[PDB]
Each structure stands twice: as structure tokens, then as C-alpha cells.
Structure 1
Amino acid sequence: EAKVTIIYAGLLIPGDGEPLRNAALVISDKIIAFVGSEADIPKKYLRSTQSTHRVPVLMPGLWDCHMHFGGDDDYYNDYTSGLATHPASSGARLARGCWEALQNGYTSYRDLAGYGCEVAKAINDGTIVGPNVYSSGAALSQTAGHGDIFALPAGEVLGSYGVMNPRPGYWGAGPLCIADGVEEVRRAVRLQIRRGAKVIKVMASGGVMSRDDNPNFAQFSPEELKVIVEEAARQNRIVSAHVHGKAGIMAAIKAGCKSLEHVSYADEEVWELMKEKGILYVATRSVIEIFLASNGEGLVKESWAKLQALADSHLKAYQGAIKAGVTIALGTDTAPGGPTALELQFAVERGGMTPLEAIKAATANAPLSVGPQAPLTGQLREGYEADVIALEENPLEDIKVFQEPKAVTHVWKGGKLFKGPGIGPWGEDARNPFL
């Protein structure tokens, strides 16, 4: 017999479309069986329902499309810590982060550098809890690219992350992958798919800080990028590209990347291209706002001016893409359980989205971030996956409501209740997996 749950909602926000007043939603097992007004609930569900809930606001589970599953020790302040941190330490930390994500109403995460694949195995076998994780495995970078650890010598970095010299020690399974040339890059992509990656991530321009590589300059050759995209496509993955400057943006687009990150120097030409080819825009404004709040605290005056210049372009680019009708999704660029809700605030207060459009970007649009790997999800619609959250207050009146996890009262993932009144930390019917 099927497990039926009825949820009555004062306000129901479907994800893409006008909200409904005095609505109801039916869950049958893993899927959403009915959505519409309370009066029109099909009678068969009224007869069979195992339980009913009554909440002020109901909506789809939230996505963040730019996470990194690092779980780093707090010893080194740069990417050295990705290398130096033992992955067992990382996985333990990510377990807390995944718990915290789900308690905040985030039911799907796109991991773009780290151990998402490996940690997903502990979610999927029931040992821990968390969002659906769609991981890139390692971010792919060139030597001297944004993925390289410039402070370490090169042999140490490529010994750890290169695709030559197979060896013991979990070779080809770190947060970063360095490959140079068409030959190496084929293996780079395949090594992530091997881990179970459901997306591919490349560094296609320099890092936002201008110290080693330059954000204005492209990374990888067009030849390498095209192969990377072809390799991903053959297994039904799309590629996501880290891009700031227009050189990087255009090279990534030409190659066939279907998701761009940051996109700091996107202009009219870029917005039209992205619309034309169905390329997703993930701004990660949180990352810029963090360093803006620092005020150039330890930085040299000219480097701080450079960061502000980039911050202004990034704002124009984001606002322009929103005005131009480019398809947008929300991503924070943080660890699991990080301040992802802020990105919704920035979508409204910086981007100029309505609260309703901001929610569309974190729900209905978000599965586009993994292309053909997405199930029917991110919307409260019949036949879609039952990833549903309930709120105490109406986020359309204050988008900051998501920044208080107590305001998220109920969390369903695949029809299963992971947070709610009377529900323990590890979800309904949780048992000790080691007993």
C-alpha cells in the first residue's frame, strides 16, 4: 500500500507560477500526487491518507547550485588545506554540514569541487542525512589555473591531482584535478564520472583575487574545452564553467558549456548568447559581498580598487542578465550548511528580482544546473519529486525569512519527513544504522 500525506497550505508557492491561497498538496510515496485548492482534493486521498498537516506556507525544497564539499581543517587559509586535510576529517565535517542544510530547507545541492560523490554514498545508504547531492567530483584546472595551489611547488600539486602516474592512495579522487592537453583532459573528465559525478566543472578563467592568475584572462585552450564538453555530453552531463572576464565567458560558451558561474563581465552580447543557447547564469553574489564587507582590510590599495571595480561589473552583469531575461539559478559558493539563504536576499536586493522570481531561481530553475541528470523536481506539481518544505511566515513579504532555520518547520525529501514536529534529528523512523 502507498503512503499518502495531505498538506493543507494557507499559501502555496509552486516554484514557477502564481501562488495559491488555501491550497493542498498530496504526497504518494516519493512523488507529488496532487496540487490545487483544498476544496478539490480527490476523495480517494481523503480516505487513504496516513497523516495530515496544516501549515501557513508551502513551497518546493531549495537548491543551491554552487557548493563545495571541502570539509577542510582550519589550519591553512588557502587551497593548501584541500591537499593537507585528510578526507576522513573532511567527510565527518561534511556530515554536519549536510544535516544543517536539510534543517534549513535545502533538499538539493550542486557540489562543484570536493567529495560530494563520496559523501553521497553515506546519504544514499541511510547512514547520514542530507540534500540530494549532484557532484562534479574534482574541479578541472590547467597547470597555473584557478585550481592550482600556487604556494606549493608544482610536483607536489600534480603528484596529488594530476592524471598521470597512477598509484596507491585514492589517486584521481580529490577536490581538484590538473590536466594539460587534449589527451589528459579526456581522462580528467572520465575520472570524475568514475566517482559518480553528475556534472563537470572547469576553471575557464582566473580567480577573483588578481594575485597569481588573472580573472580577465581565459583558462584552458578552446581545444581542451571542446573535448571536455564532448566527454561530459557522451555520458549525459553538462559542463559548468568558472568565468569572470569576457575572454573566459566567450571561450566557455563557444565550447558548449551550459552553466556559467560568477559571470562578472557579462554584457549585452553575453546575455543574448546565453538566452539563445539555453545557458544557465549562476551569479554567486555572496562571494563578492563577503570581500566587500571586509573593506580591503589587508590588501594593497590598488588591489582593493581592482576588487571594487570587479564588484561593480559583477553587479551590472547580474542586473543586466535579470533584465534581459537570461535563465538564472542561485548559488552561494560556500561549504554545506553555509549561509546559502543570503543569496536569495542578494537576488532581490542586488539583482532586482521580485521575491517570487528569486524563489523561482532557487527552485524551479535550479535543476537546469545539472542538465539531463535532473529528475522532475524543484516544483510543486503533479508527477514531480516530493521535495517540499513548510514555512511559518510568507517569504514573499520578506525574503530574509529563509535566514532563520526555525522558520522552516517541515522538510520532506523524496516524500520522507526529515524535519517536523515530533521528528528526531535523523528523520522519521530513523534507526541506528550500526545496530
Structure 2
Amino acid sequence: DEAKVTIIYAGLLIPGDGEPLRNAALVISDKIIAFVGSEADIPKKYLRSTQSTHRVPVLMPGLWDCHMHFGGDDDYYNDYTSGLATHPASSGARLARGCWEALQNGYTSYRDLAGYGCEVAKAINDGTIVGPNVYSSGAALSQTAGHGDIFALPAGEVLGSYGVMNPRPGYWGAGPLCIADGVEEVRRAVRLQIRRGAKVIKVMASGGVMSRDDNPNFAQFSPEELKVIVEEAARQNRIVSAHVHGKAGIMAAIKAGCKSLEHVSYADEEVWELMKEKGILYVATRSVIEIFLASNGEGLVKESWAKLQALADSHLKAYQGAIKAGVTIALGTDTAPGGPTALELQFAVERGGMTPLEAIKAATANAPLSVGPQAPLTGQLREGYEADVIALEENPLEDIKVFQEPKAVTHVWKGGKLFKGPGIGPWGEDARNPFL
């Protein structure tokens, strides 16, 4: 019948791309952004129709983390074994709390690279719980003995749970991990994730630090296997995000047509010029490294000295030079939902050497590039884009660490609906118990 209009005046309006605005105003018609500009120039059309108005210090688009892991693991096992042993109900319950906190922190979009993102996003989407927009990969695809693999378990236990062969009862094809070997098997692997509703595909294209036995210098999967994985994704209009450390894996991922790279630890002059020339998103995921450098190995298994300082330093140079060279960048934390995503911003500025303005851009305007065609117009405060907007109390351009205080976010709009705000309940506005 009639559009639901909300007007928001802002002391400072940070739009995602382009300079921030002073004493500006933004309008929301229903689910989308109807106006952005200085407070003076608001259409009178909207002044007449609105039924809601807020004034806030700082206004900016909703934040994205682009590397998240919907695990909800039990705290029993230190390594990936928890992934398999944890019953998905326990995981689901925990992932609820995490998605809440995420939203409560102004994170309105997540790209889940391994986990139950697909299965949980439906409890979000029927409104049984609340959370960011979730763009899941279903399971990460890994070769046998790949970064995905659980080396501490016998191969049979692992491939029984996560292989693409021998269908069976017990939610075959719907785990955090998917082990495929060969061109035939990777086809089913890609397709099994699409079946769950995945909006991006994740591959382990090089060795990793979290897996116990495997070496990050070396590539994983064949060029043959990766080409197919990309093509399979491309046909359903997904893109592939590749986890890579060594240069070998990085170049294989680029050759195959992957469009997002994670960590990219051994990126050098050649890699940056490529990622630009080919328009590939670089996601450093620095948080993990800095968290554990400071931890000095609390929380990890002793074989995760793999990260070392050779890796830690290389990784930094890669991120820094990528910035300097002008590679498109977005921000990922590599943690559970509700984890300290805000940190990545800090490290963008302090370690990569961005301006706060650019770090905000990597968290907002650029972040939807992480799912390519599955993204709407969003991550920016601009007419026509999706009304995912948040309001602040302090100016992040002065202090970027402001995001690490959840109370500093006062208003949270996702799809033009208000989930956190003054005298707004824990499950957002006009909330009602879905079980009645």
C-alpha cells in the first residue's frame, strides 16, 4: 500500500566510496536507500511522508567481514577434529549467539568460507533468529591430504564424513568440509554446496597453518581440478575464493580463474599486477597472525609454528605492497561469528598502512566483490543500494579502534529494518516470539 520511510540526519556521513559528508541526511524507503546528500537538499516528498527520524553523529554503511567460519565447535578438541565430532545442533545453537553479537556490532554481511552458513541462514531468513546477511560456501573444498584434511584421524573416518562418494543417511554432502580428488569428484563437490544454497565457493589451493601436516609453500589441487571448480561455479554465477599462501598456489588459483584470494602470504610484484589486471579481490586476514604472534602460541597446536616469522613477515609485506600497488582489498578476520572482526580494521590501518577511510572502504564498498554476481547493490550509502546502515557515537576516522567497542554502535539497519537502536529489543523491532 504505502512505503515505510525513515529519515536519518548525520553529523558525519561516510558513504563507503568517495569523500565523507558533513551534516548530511539519508532516506530509507522500505528495504532500500532513497536519498543521500546534505541535510538541506532532502526531497520534500519524503519530509511529508516519513514516520521516523533519527539524528546521529556518524553514519556509515553496514560492515562486512569477508572470511568467517560458521563452526560453532565444542571446546573439547583443539584441532579440526572438533569440526567432525561436534554435533551440528550444538553448532547451530552456538552460531545463533554469534550471529546476534555480529549484528549487535554493526556487521550486516558475512562471507562464511567454511561451515553451516547455509543451514543457519535459513533460521535467520525465516526470522527465527537474527543475524547478518550470510553468503556461505557450504563446505570448503579440499583435496585428500589438503589443508582441509584432519590429519590426526584415519583417512577412512574423514572421507566417510566428507567425501563425494557413497551417499548415505546422516546429511551426506552437508558438512564443513568436502574432500574431492579428481575432475569427476570436484564436479559433485561444487554442486553439493550449490545444493545447500551456497553463494560462493571455497577451495584450499595451497597448504595451511591450521591443518597439522601440510606445508603452505606448496600448491594443492591440480590446475585441471581448479579449472573445473571455477567453471562449475561460473555456470551458477558463483565465483571461487581460494585460500593460498605459497606463490605456487597463488598463481595456480589465478590461472584457474579464482576471483578472491585469502591470506596471499607470498604475494609479490608479479601477483599484485595480476590481481589488478584480472580484478581479483585480495583478503589478507591479518587478525589471525597478529592474534597468535601476541599470544605466542596459546590456543594452538605445537605444529602451528608453521606460521613462524618467515610466514608472518612475508604475509605483511604482501599486504603492504598490495595496498601500495593499488590492489582491490577487502577485510576478513577468519573467526566464528561474534568474534573480534573489528580488529581487522585496526590492522588494516596499523599494519597494512591504510588510511581509516580506505579501511572502511575495504570493509564496506569493496566487500560485496567477495561474492561477485551474488551481491546486490550494497555496502555503500548511496541511492538505490540496500538499506544496510549503522550509526555511531564516535568518529572512526580519528580513532579506528572505536569499532572494538560494541556500545559505540547505536543503530543497526539491515534491509531497512531496525535491529539495534534506542529502546529496541534484543531481536529487533516489532519483534514477536516466532513459536506462538
Question: What's the TM-score, normalizing by structure 1?
Answer: 0.98
Deviation at 1:232, TM superposition (A): 0.1
Deviates more, 1:293-302 or 1:12-21: 293-302
Matched-pair contact (CA < 8 Å) for 1:271–1:324:
yes
Q: Which residue of the partner structure matches residue 312 of structure 1?
A: 313
Q: Secondary structure at the match of 2:64?
A: strand
**Aligned sequence identity (%):** 100
Deviations 1:162-204 (Å, cap 9, x if unpaired)?
Answer: 0000000000000000000000000000000000000000000
Deviation at 1:211, TM superposition (A): 4.7
Q: Which residue of the partner structure matches residue 326 of structure 1?
A: 327
Deviation at 1:346, TM superposition (A): 0.2
Deviations 1:24-74 (Å, cap 9, x if unpaired)?
Answer: 000000000000000000001001101100000000000000000000000
Deviation at 1:218, TM superposition (A): 0.2
Deviations 1:352-378 (Å, cap 9, x if unpaired)?
Answer: 000000000000000000000000000
Deviations 1:402-430 (Å, cap 9, x if unpaired)?
Answer: 00000000000000000000100000000
CA distance in 2, matches of 1:108, 1:419: 15
Deviations 1:89-117 (Å, cap 9, x if unpaired)?
Answer: 00000000000000000000000000000
Deviation at 1:297, TM superposition (A): 6.1
Q: Which residue of the partner structure matches residue 137 of structure 1?
A: 138
Matched-pair contact (CA < 8 Å) for 2:67–2:334:
yes
CA distance in 2, matches of 1:7, 1:298: 43
Deviation at 1:208, TM superposition (A): 2.1
CA distance in 1, matches of 2:81, 2:306: 27
Matched-pair contact (CA < 8 Å) for 1:12–1:23:
yes
CA distance in 1, matches of 2:12, 2:300: 48
CA distance in 1, matches of 2:376, 2:93: 28
Deviations 1:107-152 (Å, cap 9, x if unpaired)?
Answer: 0000000000000000000100000000000000000000010000
Matched-pair contact (CA < 8 Å) for 2:62–2:109:
yes
Matched-pair contact (CA < 8 Å) for 1:103–1:405:
yes
Deviation at 1:245, TM superposition (A): 0.5
CA distance in 2, matches of 1:269, 1:185: 29
Matched-pair contact (CA < 8 Å) for 2:204–2:220:
yes
Q: Secondary structure at the match of 1:219?
A: coil
- Is 1:274 paired with 2:269? no
Deviation at 1:20, TM superposition (A): 0.4
Matched-pair contact (CA < 8 Å) for 1:208–1:244:
no
Deviation at 1:295, TM superposition (A): 2.4
* Structure 1: gaps of 5 or more residues: none
Deviation at 1:305, TM superposition (A): 8.3
CA distance in 2, matches of 1:298, 1:402: 24
- Cα–Cα, structure 1 residues 7 and 95, in superposed 2: closer, same or farther, change >3 Å? same
Deviation at 1:347, TM superposition (A): 0.1
Q: Secondary structure at the match of 1:270?
A: helix
CA distance in 2, matches of 1:306, 1:146: 14
Deviations 1:374-416 (Å, cap 9, x if unpaired)?
Answer: 0000000000000000000100000000000000000000000
Matched-pair contact (CA < 8 Å) for 1:209–1:215:
no
Matched-pair contact (CA < 8 Å) for 2:285–2:331:
yes
- Cα–Cα, structure 1 residues 409 and 296, in superposed 2: closer, same or farther, change >3 Å? closer
Q: Secondary structure at the match of 1:318?
A: helix
- Cα–Cα, structure 1 residues 335 and 300, in superposed 2: closer, same or farther, change >3 Å? closer
CA distance in 2, matches of 1:96, 1:296: 27
Deviation at 1:296, TM superposition (A): 4.7
Q: Which residue of the partner structure matches residue 187 of structure 1?
A: 188
CA distance in 2, matches of 1:132, 1:301: 36
- Cα–Cα, structure 1 residues 379 and 156, in superposed 2: closer, same or farther, change >3 Å? same
- Cα–Cα, structure 1 residues 137 and 284, in superposed 2: closer, same or farther, change >3 Å? same
Q: Secondary structure at the match of 1:350?
A: helix
CA distance in 2, matches of 1:301, 1:286: 19
Matched-pair contact (CA < 8 Å) for 1:315–1:351:
yes
Deviation at 1:16, TM superposition (A): 0.3
- Cα–Cα, structure 1 residues 152 and 408, in superposed 2: closer, same or farther, change >3 Å? same
Deviation at 1:290, TM superposition (A): 1.7
Matched-pair contact (CA < 8 Å) for 1:205–1:243:
yes
CA distance in 2, matches of 1:121, 1:111: 14
Deviation at 1:294, TM superposition (A): 2.4
> Over aligned residues, Cα RMSD in angstroms?
1.4
Q: Which residue of the partner structure matches residue 160 of structure 1?
A: 161
Question: What's the TM-score, normalizing by structure 2?
Answer: 0.98
CA distance in 2, matches of 1:151, 1:260: 27
Deviation at 1:293, TM superposition (A): 1.0
Matched-pair contact (CA < 8 Å) for 2:78–2:301:
no
- Cα–Cα, structure 1 residues 297 and 174, in superposed 2: closer, same or farther, change >3 Å? closer
Q: Secondary structure at the match of 1:431?
A: coil
Matched-pair contact (CA < 8 Å) for 1:206–1:217:
yes
CA distance in 2, matches of 1:419, 1:302: 42
Q: Secondary structure at the match of 1:422?
A: coil
CA distance in 2, matches of 1:314, 1:68: 21
CA distance in 2, matches of 1:303, 1:22: 49
CA distance in 2, matches of 1:122, 1:423: 21
- Cα–Cα, structure 1 residues 302 and 229, in superposed 2: closer, same or farther, change >3 Å? closer
Matched-pair contact (CA < 8 Å) for 1:209–1:307:
no
- Cα–Cα, structure 1 residues 359 and 168, in superposed 2: closer, same or farther, change >3 Å? same
Q: Secondary structure at the match of 1:272?
A: helix
- Cα–Cα, structure 1 residues 276 and 130, in superposed 2: closer, same or farther, change >3 Å? same
Deviations 1:193-234 (Å, cap 9, x if unpaired)?
Answer: 000000000000011258501000000000000000000000
Deviates more, 1:305-314 or 1:331-340: 305-314
Deviation at 1:306, TM superposition (A): 5.9
Q: Secondary structure at the match of 2:307?
A: helix
Matched-pair contact (CA < 8 Å) for 1:217–1:245:
yes
